Amino acid sequence: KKRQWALEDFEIGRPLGKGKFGNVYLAREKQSKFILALKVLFKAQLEKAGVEHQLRREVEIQSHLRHPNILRLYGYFHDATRVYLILEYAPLGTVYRELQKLSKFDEQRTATYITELANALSYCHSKRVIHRDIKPENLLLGSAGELKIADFGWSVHAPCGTLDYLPPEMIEGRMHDEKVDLWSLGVLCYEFLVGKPPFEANTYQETYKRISRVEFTFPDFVTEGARDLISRLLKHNPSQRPMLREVLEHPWITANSSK
Numbered sequence: 294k295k296r297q298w299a300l301e302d303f304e305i306g307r308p309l310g311k312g313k314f315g316n317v318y319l320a321r322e323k324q325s326k327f328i329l330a331l332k333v334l335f336k337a338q339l340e341k342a343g344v345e346h347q348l349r350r351e352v353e354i355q356s357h358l359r360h361p362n363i364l365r366l367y368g369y370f371h372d373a374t375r376v377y378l379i380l381e382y383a384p385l386g387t388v389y390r391e392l393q394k395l396s397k398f399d400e401q402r403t404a405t406y407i408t409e410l411a412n413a414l415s416y417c418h419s420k421r422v423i424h425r426d427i428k429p430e431n432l433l434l435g436s437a438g439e440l441k442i443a444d445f446g447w448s449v450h451a452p453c454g455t456l457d458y459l460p461p462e463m464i465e466g467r468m469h470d471e472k473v474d475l476w477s478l479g480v481l482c483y484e485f486l487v488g489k490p491p492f493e494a495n496t497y498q499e500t501y502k503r504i505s506r507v508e509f510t511f512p513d514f515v516t517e518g519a520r521d522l523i524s525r526l527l528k529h530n531p532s533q534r535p536m537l538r539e540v541l542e543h544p545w546i547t548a549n550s551s552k
Protein backbone atom coordinates (compact mmCIF):
# COMPACT_ATOMS: atom_id res chain seq x y z
CA LYS A 294 0.00 0.00 0.00
CA LYS A 295 0.83 3.75 -0.24
CA ARG A 296 -0.08 4.76 3.34
CA GLN A 297 0.07 4.02 7.09
CA TRP A 298 -3.39 4.38 8.53
CA ALA A 299 -4.37 5.44 12.03
CA LEU A 300 -7.75 6.33 13.54
CA GLU A 301 -6.71 9.97 13.75
CA ASP A 302 -6.62 10.08 9.89
CA PHE A 303 -10.41 9.82 9.85
CA GLU A 304 -13.39 11.80 11.06
CA ILE A 305 -16.00 9.32 12.15
CA GLY A 306 -19.68 9.86 11.38
CA ARG A 307 -22.86 7.98 12.08
CA PRO A 308 -23.19 4.16 12.34
CA LEU A 309 -24.16 2.51 9.08
CA GLY A 310 -24.87 -0.97 10.46
CA LYS A 311 -24.09 -3.12 13.55
CA GLY A 312 -22.56 -6.57 13.10
CA LYS A 313 -21.70 -9.43 15.44
CA PHE A 314 -18.00 -8.46 15.70
CA GLY A 315 -18.61 -4.72 15.54
CA ASN A 316 -20.07 -1.80 13.66
CA VAL A 317 -19.62 -0.05 10.34
CA TYR A 318 -19.28 3.72 10.43
CA LEU A 319 -19.42 6.51 7.93
CA ALA A 320 -16.12 8.25 7.85
CA ARG A 321 -14.12 10.90 6.05
CA GLU A 322 -10.39 10.91 5.52
CA LYS A 323 -9.30 14.29 6.91
CA GLN A 324 -6.70 15.41 4.35
CA SER A 325 -8.33 14.25 1.11
CA LYS A 326 -11.97 14.65 2.25
CA PHE A 327 -12.62 11.18 0.79
CA ILE A 328 -15.80 9.64 2.22
CA LEU A 329 -15.71 5.96 3.11
CA ALA A 330 -16.94 3.24 5.47
CA LEU A 331 -14.88 2.03 8.43
CA LYS A 332 -15.71 -1.39 9.76
CA VAL A 333 -14.44 -1.81 13.26
CA LEU A 334 -13.90 -5.25 14.72
CA PHE A 335 -12.89 -6.13 18.28
CA LYS A 336 -9.79 -8.31 18.49
CA ALA A 337 -10.91 -10.09 21.67
CA GLN A 338 -14.16 -11.16 19.97
CA LEU A 339 -12.31 -12.38 16.85
CA GLU A 340 -9.89 -14.32 18.98
CA LYS A 341 -12.52 -15.97 21.17
CA ALA A 342 -14.66 -16.91 18.18
CA GLY A 343 -11.49 -18.41 16.49
CA VAL A 344 -11.74 -16.29 13.23
CA GLU A 345 -8.82 -13.88 13.79
CA HIS A 346 -6.43 -15.33 11.26
CA GLN A 347 -9.27 -16.16 8.80
CA LEU A 348 -10.10 -12.44 8.61
CA ARG A 349 -6.40 -11.66 7.85
CA ARG A 350 -6.52 -14.02 4.83
CA GLU A 351 -9.78 -12.63 3.53
CA VAL A 352 -8.48 -9.09 3.85
CA GLU A 353 -5.36 -9.96 1.79
CA ILE A 354 -7.56 -11.61 -0.86
CA GLN A 355 -9.99 -8.67 -0.80
CA SER A 356 -7.18 -6.11 -1.10
CA HIS A 357 -6.40 -7.43 -4.64
CA LEU A 358 -10.02 -7.37 -5.92
CA ARG A 359 -11.04 -4.47 -8.20
CA HIS A 360 -14.43 -4.62 -9.91
CA PRO A 361 -17.41 -2.19 -9.95
CA ASN A 362 -19.64 -4.79 -8.22
CA ILE A 363 -17.18 -5.78 -5.52
CA LEU A 364 -16.93 -3.39 -2.57
CA ARG A 365 -13.44 -1.91 -2.54
CA LEU A 366 -11.07 -2.41 0.45
CA TYR A 367 -8.63 0.55 0.43
CA GLY A 368 -6.58 -0.47 3.47
CA TYR A 369 -6.70 -1.62 7.07
CA PHE A 370 -4.88 -1.16 10.39
CA HIS A 371 -5.19 -1.87 14.10
CA ASP A 372 -4.71 -0.72 17.66
CA ALA A 373 -4.54 -2.58 20.98
CA THR A 374 -8.19 -3.64 20.88
CA ARG A 375 -9.64 -3.19 17.41
CA VAL A 376 -9.17 -4.00 13.76
CA TYR A 377 -10.25 -1.36 11.23
CA LEU A 378 -11.27 -1.99 7.62
CA ILE A 379 -11.21 1.02 5.32
CA LEU A 380 -13.92 0.48 2.70
CA GLU A 381 -15.78 1.97 -0.19
CA TYR A 382 -18.96 3.64 1.04
CA ALA A 383 -22.19 2.41 -0.61
CA PRO A 384 -24.62 5.22 -0.11
CA LEU A 385 -27.95 3.42 -0.90
CA GLY A 386 -27.32 0.81 1.81
CA THR A 387 -28.05 -2.91 1.82
CA VAL A 388 -30.10 -5.02 -0.52
CA TYR A 389 -31.60 -6.57 2.63
CA ARG A 390 -33.21 -3.29 3.55
CA GLU A 391 -34.40 -2.66 0.02
CA LEU A 392 -35.97 -6.16 0.05
CA GLN A 393 -37.78 -5.37 3.38
CA LYS A 394 -39.10 -2.08 2.03
CA LEU A 395 -40.37 -3.71 -1.23
CA SER A 396 -41.10 -7.23 0.14
CA LYS A 397 -39.95 -8.61 -3.20
CA PHE A 398 -38.21 -7.46 -6.37
CA ASP A 399 -39.67 -7.40 -9.88
CA GLU A 400 -38.06 -9.47 -12.62
CA GLN A 401 -35.98 -6.64 -14.08
CA ARG A 402 -34.41 -5.59 -10.81
CA THR A 403 -33.74 -9.24 -9.98
CA ALA A 404 -32.28 -10.12 -13.39
CA THR A 405 -30.01 -7.07 -13.22
CA TYR A 406 -28.80 -7.93 -9.72
CA ILE A 407 -28.14 -11.48 -10.81
CA THR A 408 -26.16 -10.22 -13.83
CA GLU A 409 -24.09 -7.94 -11.70
CA LEU A 410 -23.43 -10.71 -9.13
CA ALA A 411 -22.53 -13.11 -11.86
CA ASN A 412 -20.06 -10.66 -13.43
CA ALA A 413 -18.37 -10.15 -10.03
CA LEU A 414 -18.22 -13.88 -9.36
CA SER A 415 -16.84 -14.48 -12.82
CA TYR A 416 -14.07 -11.95 -12.16
CA CYS A 417 -13.41 -13.71 -8.81
CA HIS A 418 -13.32 -17.21 -10.45
CA SER A 419 -10.68 -15.87 -12.86
CA LYS A 420 -8.63 -15.34 -9.66
CA ARG A 421 -9.66 -18.62 -7.90
CA VAL A 422 -11.74 -16.81 -5.31
CA ILE A 423 -15.06 -18.06 -3.90
CA HIS A 424 -17.80 -17.08 -1.42
CA ARG A 425 -19.82 -18.70 1.30
CA ASP A 426 -22.80 -16.85 2.76
CA ILE A 427 -23.78 -14.27 0.17
CA LYS A 428 -26.89 -12.73 1.47
CA PRO A 429 -28.90 -9.65 1.02
CA GLU A 430 -27.42 -8.31 4.30
CA ASN A 431 -23.91 -8.54 2.69
CA LEU A 432 -24.89 -6.98 -0.63
CA LEU A 433 -24.78 -3.19 -0.86
CA LEU A 434 -26.01 -0.46 -3.17
CA GLY A 435 -23.83 2.23 -4.84
CA SER A 436 -24.92 5.81 -5.69
CA ALA A 437 -26.71 4.70 -8.87
CA GLY A 438 -28.26 1.61 -7.35
CA GLU A 439 -25.49 -0.70 -8.56
CA LEU A 440 -24.91 -3.89 -6.58
CA LYS A 441 -21.70 -4.22 -4.51
CA ILE A 442 -20.57 -7.43 -2.84
CA ALA A 443 -19.41 -6.61 0.65
CA ASP A 444 -18.98 -10.23 1.84
CA PHE A 445 -15.24 -10.85 1.60
CA GLY A 446 -13.68 -13.58 -0.62
CA TRP A 447 -13.76 -16.84 1.43
CA SER A 448 -10.73 -18.62 3.00
CA VAL A 449 -11.15 -22.04 4.80
CA HIS A 450 -10.21 -23.18 8.38
CA ALA A 451 -7.96 -26.18 9.22
CA PRO A 452 -8.91 -29.64 7.81
CA CYS A 453 -23.69 -22.86 14.96
CA GLY A 454 -24.19 -20.53 11.90
CA THR A 455 -27.30 -19.92 9.65
CA LEU A 456 -27.78 -22.49 6.84
CA ASP A 457 -30.06 -20.57 4.43
CA TYR A 458 -27.35 -19.63 1.97
CA LEU A 459 -25.12 -22.72 2.09
CA PRO A 460 -25.05 -25.44 -0.64
CA PRO A 461 -25.32 -29.20 0.04
CA GLU A 462 -21.59 -29.75 -0.36
CA MET A 463 -20.67 -27.30 2.42
CA ILE A 464 -23.14 -28.72 4.86
CA GLU A 465 -22.85 -32.46 4.19
CA GLY A 466 -19.15 -32.06 5.13
CA ARG A 467 -18.17 -32.79 1.49
CA MET A 468 -15.54 -31.32 -0.90
CA HIS A 469 -16.45 -27.89 -2.35
CA ASP A 470 -15.65 -25.87 -5.54
CA GLU A 471 -16.45 -22.48 -7.28
CA LYS A 472 -19.81 -24.07 -8.10
CA VAL A 473 -20.88 -23.07 -4.59
CA ASP A 474 -21.29 -19.58 -6.02
CA LEU A 475 -23.68 -20.91 -8.65
CA TRP A 476 -25.79 -22.30 -5.80
CA SER A 477 -25.62 -18.85 -4.14
CA LEU A 478 -27.09 -17.21 -7.29
CA GLY A 479 -29.95 -19.62 -7.27
CA VAL A 480 -30.77 -18.92 -3.62
CA LEU A 481 -30.56 -15.19 -4.21
CA CYS A 482 -32.57 -15.22 -7.40
CA TYR A 483 -35.31 -17.06 -5.55
CA GLU A 484 -35.15 -14.74 -2.54
CA PHE A 485 -35.18 -11.59 -4.66
CA LEU A 486 -38.33 -12.73 -6.46
CA VAL A 487 -40.14 -14.45 -3.59
CA GLY A 488 -39.07 -12.37 -0.56
CA LYS A 489 -37.62 -15.27 1.45
CA PRO A 490 -34.88 -17.81 0.74
CA PRO A 491 -36.05 -21.11 -0.56
CA PHE A 492 -35.00 -23.54 2.21
CA GLU A 493 -36.14 -21.50 5.17
CA ALA A 494 -37.74 -23.11 8.25
CA ASN A 495 -38.16 -22.44 12.01
CA THR A 496 -35.34 -24.85 12.80
CA TYR A 497 -31.72 -25.32 11.59
CA GLN A 498 -31.94 -29.10 11.43
CA GLU A 499 -35.13 -28.87 9.22
CA THR A 500 -33.35 -26.34 6.97
CA TYR A 501 -30.45 -28.84 6.71
CA LYS A 502 -32.83 -31.57 5.39
CA ARG A 503 -34.45 -29.16 2.96
CA ILE A 504 -31.07 -28.22 1.48
CA SER A 505 -29.70 -31.75 1.37
CA ARG A 506 -32.86 -32.88 -0.44
CA VAL A 507 -33.10 -29.69 -2.46
CA GLU A 508 -36.68 -29.60 -1.25
CA PHE A 509 -38.47 -26.28 -2.20
CA THR A 510 -41.50 -24.90 -4.02
CA PHE A 511 -42.27 -21.81 -6.08
CA PRO A 512 -45.21 -19.54 -5.45
CA ASP A 513 -47.62 -19.39 -8.36
CA PHE A 514 -46.42 -15.92 -9.56
CA VAL A 515 -42.84 -17.04 -10.26
CA THR A 516 -42.61 -17.28 -14.05
CA GLU A 517 -41.30 -20.22 -16.11
CA GLY A 518 -38.02 -18.53 -17.24
CA ALA A 519 -37.25 -17.77 -13.63
CA ARG A 520 -38.20 -21.31 -12.53
CA ASP A 521 -35.87 -22.58 -15.22
CA LEU A 522 -32.92 -20.53 -14.03
CA ILE A 523 -33.41 -21.21 -10.37
CA SER A 524 -33.89 -24.93 -10.87
CA ARG A 525 -30.67 -25.27 -12.92
CA LEU A 526 -28.71 -23.42 -10.23
CA LEU A 527 -30.10 -25.34 -7.31
CA LYS A 528 -28.81 -28.74 -8.53
CA HIS A 529 -27.73 -31.03 -5.75
CA ASN A 530 -24.75 -32.18 -7.83
CA PRO A 531 -22.30 -29.26 -8.31
CA SER A 532 -21.30 -30.46 -11.82
CA GLN A 533 -24.93 -30.17 -13.10
CA ARG A 534 -25.04 -26.41 -12.26
CA PRO A 535 -24.45 -24.19 -15.21
CA MET A 536 -21.44 -21.99 -15.82
CA LEU A 537 -21.53 -18.29 -15.16
CA ARG A 538 -21.60 -17.54 -18.88
CA GLU A 539 -24.73 -19.71 -19.18
CA VAL A 540 -26.35 -17.68 -16.41
CA LEU A 541 -25.49 -14.44 -18.21
CA GLU A 542 -26.79 -15.88 -21.52
CA HIS A 543 -29.97 -17.40 -20.08
CA PRO A 544 -33.03 -16.07 -22.02
CA TRP A 545 -34.87 -14.91 -18.86
CA ILE A 546 -31.78 -12.95 -17.71
CA THR A 547 -31.30 -11.44 -21.18
CA ALA A 548 -35.04 -10.67 -21.51
CA ASN A 549 -35.13 -8.82 -18.16
CA SER A 550 -31.63 -7.54 -17.33
CA SER A 551 -30.65 -3.85 -17.89
CA LYS A 552 -27.93 -3.72 -20.64
Ligand SMILES: COCCOc1ccc2cc1OCC(=O)N(C)CCCNCc1c[nH]c3ncnc(c13)N2
Nearest residue numbers: 309310311312317330381382383386387430443445
Ligand atom coordinates in the same frame (compact mmCIF):
# COMPACT_ATOMS: atom_id res chain seq x y z
C1 LIG B 1 -15.22 -8.85 7.63
O1 LIG B 1 -15.82 -7.73 7.09
C2 LIG B 1 -16.08 -7.87 5.69
C3 LIG B 1 -16.71 -6.61 5.13
O2 LIG B 1 -18.12 -6.67 5.36
C4 LIG B 1 -18.84 -5.50 5.25
C5 LIG B 1 -18.37 -4.36 4.65
C6 LIG B 1 -19.16 -3.23 4.60
C7 LIG B 1 -20.44 -3.23 5.16
C8 LIG B 1 -20.93 -4.38 5.75
C9 LIG B 1 -20.13 -5.52 5.82
O3 LIG B 1 -20.49 -6.68 6.45
C10 LIG B 1 -21.83 -6.83 6.92
C11 LIG B 1 -21.97 -6.10 8.24
O4 LIG B 1 -20.97 -5.97 8.93
N1 LIG B 1 -23.15 -5.52 8.58
C12 LIG B 1 -23.32 -4.81 9.84
C13 LIG B 1 -24.30 -5.46 7.69
C14 LIG B 1 -24.65 -3.99 7.44
C15 LIG B 1 -24.31 -3.43 6.09
N2 LIG B 1 -23.72 -2.10 6.18
C16 LIG B 1 -24.41 -1.00 5.74
C17 LIG B 1 -23.67 -0.09 4.88
C18 LIG B 1 -24.26 0.97 4.26
N3 LIG B 1 -23.37 1.58 3.43
C19 LIG B 1 -22.17 0.94 3.51
N4 LIG B 1 -21.05 1.26 2.83
C20 LIG B 1 -20.04 0.43 3.06
N5 LIG B 1 -20.01 -0.65 3.83
C21 LIG B 1 -21.14 -0.93 4.48
C22 LIG B 1 -22.31 -0.13 4.39
N6 LIG B 1 -21.18 -2.04 5.26
